[PDB]
Design an enzyme around this catalytic site. Structure first.
Site, PDB file in Angstrom:
ATOM      1  N   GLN A   1       0.838  -1.189   0.000  1.00 21.31           N
ATOM      2  CA  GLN A   1       0.000   0.000   0.000  1.00 21.31           C
ATOM      3  C   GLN A   1       0.874   1.239   0.000  1.00 21.31           C
ATOM      4  O   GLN A   1       0.877   2.015  -0.952  1.00 21.31           O
ATOM      5  CB  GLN A   1      -0.895   0.012   1.241  1.00 21.31           C
ATOM      6  CG  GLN A   1      -1.399   1.390   1.621  1.00 21.31           C
ATOM      7  CD  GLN A   1      -2.908   1.523   1.477  1.00 21.31           C
ATOM      8  OE1 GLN A   1      -3.452   1.409   0.378  1.00 21.31           O
ATOM      9  NE2 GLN A   1      -3.587   1.766   2.590  1.00 21.31           N
TER      10      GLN A   1
ATOM     11  N   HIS B   1       2.272   3.675  -3.288  1.00 18.45           N
ATOM     12  CA  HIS B   1       1.687   5.008  -3.253  1.00 18.45           C
ATOM     13  C   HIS B   1       2.544   6.168  -3.722  1.00 18.45           C
ATOM     14  O   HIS B   1       2.127   7.330  -3.626  1.00 18.45           O
ATOM     15  CB  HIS B   1       1.121   5.306  -1.867  1.00 18.45           C
ATOM     16  CG  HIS B   1      -0.367   5.169  -1.800  1.00 18.45           C
ATOM     17  ND1 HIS B   1      -1.039   4.119  -2.393  1.00 18.45           N
ATOM     18  CD2 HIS B   1      -1.318   5.968  -1.263  1.00 18.45           C
ATOM     19  CE1 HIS B   1      -2.339   4.278  -2.223  1.00 18.45           C
ATOM     20  NE2 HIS B   1      -2.536   5.393  -1.541  1.00 18.45           N
TER      21      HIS B   1
ATOM     22  N   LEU C   1      -4.266  -3.103 -11.700  1.00 21.43           N
ATOM     23  CA  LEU C   1      -3.884  -4.386 -11.110  1.00 21.43           C
ATOM     24  C   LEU C   1      -3.541  -4.216  -9.648  1.00 21.43           C
ATOM     25  O   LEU C   1      -3.640  -5.156  -8.878  1.00 21.43           O
ATOM     26  CB  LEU C   1      -2.654  -4.990 -11.793  1.00 21.43           C
ATOM     27  CG  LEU C   1      -2.387  -4.759 -13.276  1.00 21.43           C
ATOM     28  CD1 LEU C   1      -1.057  -5.419 -13.624  1.00 21.43           C
ATOM     29  CD2 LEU C   1      -3.510  -5.341 -14.126  1.00 21.43           C
ATOM     30  N   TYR C   2      -3.125  -3.014  -9.275  1.00 15.71           N
ATOM     31  CA  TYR C   2      -2.740  -2.739  -7.903  1.00 15.71           C
ATOM     32  C   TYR C   2      -3.901  -2.871  -6.954  1.00 15.71           C
ATOM     33  O   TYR C   2      -3.723  -3.389  -5.863  1.00 15.71           O
ATOM     34  CB  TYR C   2      -2.122  -1.341  -7.781  1.00 15.71           C
ATOM     35  CG  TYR C   2      -2.679  -0.513  -6.633  1.00 15.71           C
ATOM     36  CD1 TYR C   2      -2.397  -0.847  -5.303  1.00 15.71           C
ATOM     37  CD2 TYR C   2      -3.511   0.582  -6.877  1.00 15.71           C
ATOM     38  CE1 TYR C   2      -2.930  -0.116  -4.246  1.00 15.71           C
ATOM     39  CE2 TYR C   2      -4.048   1.319  -5.831  1.00 15.71           C
ATOM     40  CZ  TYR C   2      -3.757   0.967  -4.514  1.00 15.71           C
ATOM     41  OH  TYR C   2      -4.295   1.693  -3.469  1.00 15.71           O
TER      42      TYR C   2
ATOM     43  N   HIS D   1      -7.546  -4.709  -2.915  1.00 14.82           N
ATOM     44  CA  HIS D   1      -8.404  -4.601  -1.730  1.00 14.82           C
ATOM     45  C   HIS D   1      -8.532  -5.896  -0.910  1.00 14.82           C
ATOM     46  O   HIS D   1      -8.399  -5.880   0.317  1.00 14.82           O
ATOM     47  CB  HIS D   1      -9.763  -4.078  -2.178  1.00 14.82           C
ATOM     48  CG  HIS D   1      -9.666  -3.002  -3.215  1.00 14.82           C
ATOM     49  ND1 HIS D   1     -10.184  -3.133  -4.487  1.00 14.82           N
ATOM     50  CD2 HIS D   1      -9.084  -1.779  -3.170  1.00 14.82           C
ATOM     51  CE1 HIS D   1      -9.928  -2.039  -5.179  1.00 14.82           C
ATOM     52  NE2 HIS D   1      -9.261  -1.203  -4.403  1.00 14.82           N
TER      53      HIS D   1
ATOM     54  N   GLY E   1       2.128  -7.607 -13.851  1.00 16.38           N
ATOM     55  CA  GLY E   1       2.918  -6.813 -12.935  1.00 16.38           C
ATOM     56  C   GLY E   1       4.374  -7.209 -12.892  1.00 16.38           C
ATOM     57  O   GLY E   1       5.220  -6.431 -12.456  1.00 16.38           O
TER      58      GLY E   1
ATOM     59  N   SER F   1       6.576  -4.127 -13.216  1.00  8.59           N
ATOM     60  CA  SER F   1       7.337  -3.900 -12.007  1.00  8.59           C
ATOM     61  C   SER F   1       8.843  -3.851 -12.186  1.00  8.59           C
ATOM     62  O   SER F   1       9.458  -2.806 -11.969  1.00  8.59           O
ATOM     63  CB  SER F   1       7.022  -4.975 -10.984  1.00  8.59           C
ATOM     64  OG  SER F   1       8.041  -5.025 -10.001  1.00  8.59           O
TER      65      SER F   1
END
Ligand SMILES: *[C@@H]1O[C@H](CO)[C@@H](O[C@@H]2O[C@H](CO)[C@@H](O)[C@H](O)[C@H]2NC(C)=O)[C@H](O)[C@H]1NC(C)=O
Ligand SMILES: *[C@@H]1O[C@H](CO)[C@@H](O[C@@H]2O[C@H](CO)[C@@H](O)[C@H](O)[C@H]2NC(C)=O)[C@H](O)[C@H]1NC(C)=O
Ligand SMILES: CCCCC[C@@H](/C=C/[C@@H]1[C@@H](C/C=C\CCCC(=O)O)[C@@H]2C[C@H]1OO2)OO
Ligand SMILES: CCCCC[C@@H](/C=C/[C@@H]1[C@@H](C/C=C\CCCC(=O)O)[C@@H]2C[C@H]1OO2)OO
Ligand SMILES: CCCCCCCCO[C@@H]1O[C@H](CO)[C@@H](O)[C@H](O)[C@H]1O
Ligand SMILES: CCCCCCCCO[C@@H]1O[C@H](CO)[C@@H](O)[C@H](O)[C@H]1O
Ligand SMILES: *[C@@H]1O[C@H](CO)[C@@H](O)[C@H](O)[C@H]1NC(C)=O
Ligand SMILES: *[C@@H]1O[C@H](CO)[C@@H](O)[C@H](O)[C@H]1NC(C)=O
Ligand SMILES: *[C@@H]1O[C@H](CO)[C@@H](O)[C@H](O)[C@H]1NC(C)=O
Ligand SMILES: *[C@@H]1O[C@H](CO)[C@@H](O)[C@H](O)[C@H]1NC(C)=O
Lengths: 552, 552
Positions: B172, B176, B353-354, B357, B495, B499
């Protein structure tokens, strides 16, 4: 007090203050160990004992014309070479970018800030004792002196290379996208965040601007017809920001990508041309894609044009500038297996080396007439008066002043050239021998070596004393030209890398870009692959007035 | 009306409108000819008949643990592998950047504008008939449905992988910096121009901010001591911009790199850690260089820290996330002969994709207590109350929800996850089979295949009809997990590239950066090379509370 002040670390080594009065050299991937990154490794040696002097090469490049003619007509060979040339440089620049004005060590703030100009060599600690670190005096020769003592042109010296006015204004016009120093900020900061060939001078840097220069129809740039001729449009109709002197009439206040370009009928001329080029392309596209939109045409055009430019520069401009017999080729497909960083940040140095004032004539002969700087300046009325066509022809012959020979700087340009020196000083630029060493150049052991002639040399030795303490910029204009060349070795070996970076490192030269599609397909693609300053003028200008960056 | 609407061109081919109702495919360097970039070339074939399915590999990566243990201890081997892994991906992303929200064709405006989010796949012509081009209906299943029908968590599903709260908040917190969508502008625009790991969340994006977060002494970030503990400083003392709700007391209004981070004691906690890390480093440097300046320390630190981060992510976070037996290694020295573009632009996709939740628990158990979202939110008083150490320990165990399984989205998070769908739609995202095909993934032939289970599948088939018309984001959370994994194949294979780009493509991983010097030398260099979320917490947090991104 900085123990690194003395630029101890050699061969791209990195100096680090390992304590108040001690330092350390990071000879990493350098090829040399030893406290100063001097002791070489084996492959290093064999690498050097197989490294031909630039002069040697330059020579071979400019000779055996017969042979060069052979290769110049053997695709694989040509490329094989051009590539070699491409790659030869490459491993020189620091991409991704490193230092800048305020940062002598690698820093994020550095690598991040885009308003800065990257520096091929770190500045000098303001804490350092002498302007060049340690060697030299508490100061440097007054510039006024040097300026006069060896820079200002007495008898106009023509460039032996034949560099006409076309070339000059091009180089001038062209280089004006990358170099765009924001003085409000400082000498070290650029305003062209594009940091490269992005034709922002044709379409403005900001969208806002761009949009005002846009007609929003067939993706064409707003234009205007005067006396049956296509010309940039007015400031009073686009509200675009243009730098002009109070007297200029609105009907003359031209609006173009670059705000300064109005003060030089030479520049303006080119603009008008390119502008014409763009819209010209738009039509060709709208033909290919009757189903495309204004905003797509406009964008495809800009892509194609950028291509042409990158082409016309490398293949013409640069070609001539080198006087090599080998025909320089622009084909990104050469780096498609080469560890090349398709990106670019513009260096301060490269900007200074640009200060090619000597090119500038003493008068501007357009057709019959002859003008003075005092005349030419901000007098686009001139341009309008004679017409693009004449301008072309005229400028296509009016030879430009040599630049490396020495003392060949127009007096009108006085102020400028001086600044060019004053500046580098503020920006604590390094020694010319440093910047020489940097690009793997044997440093000049005597002013006489740097010039060949004994006059200026002796005159300089008076002023600088230690050859080392010789400033780059100066040394460049005074440098000892190559056999009939316009530049010395130094200026060539610095701009060569610097250039072919931002030239190649441009997006459009990358794999996922180099394809018809990217340009509305084959048709619009060919355009770039078949672009010459010649045709550029042929198409855009009436009667296809012959041209070259060479005065016959 | 766009003849390309049907996404005809295959294998990264490029579609171009060759007329109102006709198109063309740019199968360049693709490996296939044919009107649709289908017919392959020989090497292409042999290349594919030697291309093992990701699942296969993934398998091999997560098995033979014994063997993996062997290699995990033979340097060349390990690297040889890690490298392979590095390079395996690489050739996937479009760097330099290409399309974005508004641009489906390559454009300068595109490649230039940094406020945009690049798009791994072009959007869909607003002129296209159906939301996914042509396949599907005049619209897409209402989101609310799908949301409920298969997303919202009924019974909390724990991630079989052991993903504790640490991991969650890290991911998270970490993600960010890159993702920072500027909504005032739109979903497609980011505010983090850093477009990558630049710890702007710790030092702010603008210098102005950064300086306020700076103490200007030993290059340390302004901090504050509460109850004998080190904590970020107040907004009332730095005037820094922080997003907080009206009630919050100034004594609680924390100021940190990221303005939003105050609304999540989980986030804040990490900040405080890192913040502590920075200044921690500063001391180590000031030890090494008693002769350095505030602004140099501060900058070297940020360089070292960024290093650590890139390390701790790749080697821990990512490692765990993969559950591979091979120990992932972070060593740029692996690309030093690899055609890698040390640069990065953040993609919209990668951002979506992030939206992980499912990770989010139903309550937040800190020590004894258990909290609700309604509780946790903006209650840093919590953090202060228990202390970092507890928080660590606590979070180090509170398992996080699995994410690929299906219907595991907290109800509090309701709104969000919906948006996540609504958005992609606005951004005319493409079909999940498209994004699948894109990353050379065989598309899902049936919803049952995408899920394995028949329930949801059938439930979806009700809603989407054509598997093709299945939206990505959704399909991701509902995707059919890997044997006890937390993600399906799709999310991993997207990712993974995305990434390791912004991870590796970061400046500091480039040749002219990877060296002691760059970081105050060996000492401060080692720091990065010996960094683990563990130590990160060990040093920065009291008592060195054990931690992992794995709940034992
Ligand atoms: C590394 O370079 C430094 C200079 O940059 C050398 O140090 C000087 O050596 C001379 C000769 O012994 C002394 O007279 C000077 O006092 C030294 N310092 C300076 C600032 O000049 C040093 O010898 C070199 N070492 C190696 C191994 O090459
Ligand atoms: C290229 O792909 C297109 C579809 O993207 C193919 O065109 C369709 O072919 C089928 C079968 O003949 C027709 O029923 C459709 O009317 C065609 N158009 C569309 C939009 O589906 C085309 O055949 C492919 N060509 C090649 C050489 O692969
Ligand atoms: C990204 C754009 C790159 C453009 C490059 C262009 C050259 C421009 C000139 C430079 C001189 C360098 C090299 C020319 C000699 C050719 C060679 O070394 O063999 C500087 C800036 C300007 O004046 O002085 O060519
Ligand atoms: C430049 C920053 C890179 C950060 C990379 C980070 C992963 C983030 C997640 C991504 C999932 C991808 C891979 C994780 C599985 C590990 C593996 O494939 O073996 C996307 C964005 C986010 O959610 O979904 O790790
Ligand atoms: C087989 C071809 C061999 C070519 C050898 C070329 C050697 C060039 O030699 C160069 O000549 C220049 C004079 O123009 C000098 O200024 C240089 O210092 C010198 O190195
Ligand atoms: C010499 C080593 C050979 C290893 C062969 C590995 C074959 C793995 O095969 C894979 O197994 C998975 C089950 O975990 C399936 O889900 C995949 O579909 C299948 O391709
Ligand atoms: C770049 O640096 C200068 C001086 O350090 C600063 O004034 C300017 O705002 C910076 N630019 C950006 C985009 O941060
Ligand atoms: C400007 O150009 C016009 C036309 O060539 C000429 O009449 C005028 O004298 C010029 N003025 C200056 C200041 O050069
Ligand atoms: C990026 O694009 C948007 C919309 O096209 C525009 O409003 C914004 O100003 C652009 N950013 C820059 C830096 O030009
Ligand atoms: C915030 O936290 C404090 C201390 O944990 C607690 O007393 C208070 O009830 C919380 N308030 C809310 C709205 O969660």
């Amino acid at each position: 007090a900085n123990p690194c002040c003395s630029n101890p670390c050699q061969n791209r080594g990195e100096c680090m203050s390992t304590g108040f009065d001690q330092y350390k050299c990071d000879c990493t991937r350098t090829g040399f160990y030893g406290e100063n990154c001097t002791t070489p490794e084996f492959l290093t040696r064999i690498k050097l004992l197989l490294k031909p002097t630039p002069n040697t090469v330059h020579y071979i490049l400019t000779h055996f014309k017969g042979v060069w003619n052979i290769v110049n007509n053997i695709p694989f060979l040509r490329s094989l070479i051009m590539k070699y040339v491409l790659t030869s440089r490459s491993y020189l620049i620091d991409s991704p970018p490193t230092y800048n004005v305020h940062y002598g060590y690698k820093s994020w703030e550095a690598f991040s800030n885009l308003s800065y100009y990257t520096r091929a060599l770190p500045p000098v600690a303001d804490d350092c004792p002498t302007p060049m670190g340690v060697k030299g005096n508490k100061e440097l020769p007054d510039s006024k002196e040097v300026l006069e003592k060896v820079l200002l042109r007495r008898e106009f010296i023509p460039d032996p290379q034949g560099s006409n006015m076309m070339f000059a204004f091009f180089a001038q016009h062209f280089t004006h996208q990358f170099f765009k120093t924001d003085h409000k900020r400082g000498p070290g900061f650029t305003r062209g965040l594009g940091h490269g060939v992005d034709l922002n001078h044709i379409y403005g840097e900001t969208l806002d601007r761009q949009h005002k220069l846009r007609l929003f129809k067939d993706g064409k740039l707003k234009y205007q017809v005067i006396g049956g001729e296509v010309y940039p449009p007015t400031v009073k109709d686009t509200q675009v920001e243009m730098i002009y002197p109070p007297h200029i009439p609105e009907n003359l206040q031209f609006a173009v990508g670059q705000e300064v370009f109005g003060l030089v009928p030479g520049l303006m001329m080119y603009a008008t041309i390119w502008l014409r080029e763009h819209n010209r392309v738009c039509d060709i596209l709208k033909q290919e894609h009757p189903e495309w939109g204004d905003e797509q045409l406009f964008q495809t055009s800009r892509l194609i044009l950028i291509g042409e430019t990158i082409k016309i520069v490398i293949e013409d401009y640069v070609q001539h500038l080198s006087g090599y017999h080998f025909k320089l080729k622009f084909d990104p497909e050469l780096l498609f297996n080469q560890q090349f960083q398709y990106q670019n940040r513009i260096a301060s140095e490269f900007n200074t080396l640009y200060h090619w004032h000597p090119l500038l004539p003493d008068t501007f002969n357009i057709e019959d007439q002859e003008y003075s700087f005092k005349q030419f300046l901000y007098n686009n009325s001139i341009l309008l008066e004679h017409g693009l066509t004449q301008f072309v022809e005229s400028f296509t012959r009016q030879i430009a002043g040599r630049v490396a020979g020495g003392r060949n700087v127009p007096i009108a340009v006085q102020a400028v050239a001086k600044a060019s020196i004053d500046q580098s000083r503020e920006m604590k630029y390094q020694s010319l021998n440093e910047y020489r060493k940097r690009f793997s150049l044997k440093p000049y052991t005597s002013f006489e070596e740097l010039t060949g002639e004994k006059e200026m040399a002796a005159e300089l030795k008076a002023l600088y004393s230690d050859i080392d303490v010789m400033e780059l910029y100066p040394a460049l204009l005074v440098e000892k030209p190559r056999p009939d060349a316009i530049f010395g070795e130094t200026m060539v070996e610095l701009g060569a890398p610097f250039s072919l970076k931002g030239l190649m490192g441009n997006p459009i030269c990358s794999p996922q870009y180099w394809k018809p599609s990217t340009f509305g397909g084959e048709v619009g693609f060919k355009i770039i692959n078949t672009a010459s300053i010649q045709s550029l003028i042929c198409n855009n200008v009436k009667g296809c007035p012959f041209t070259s960056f060479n005065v016959q």
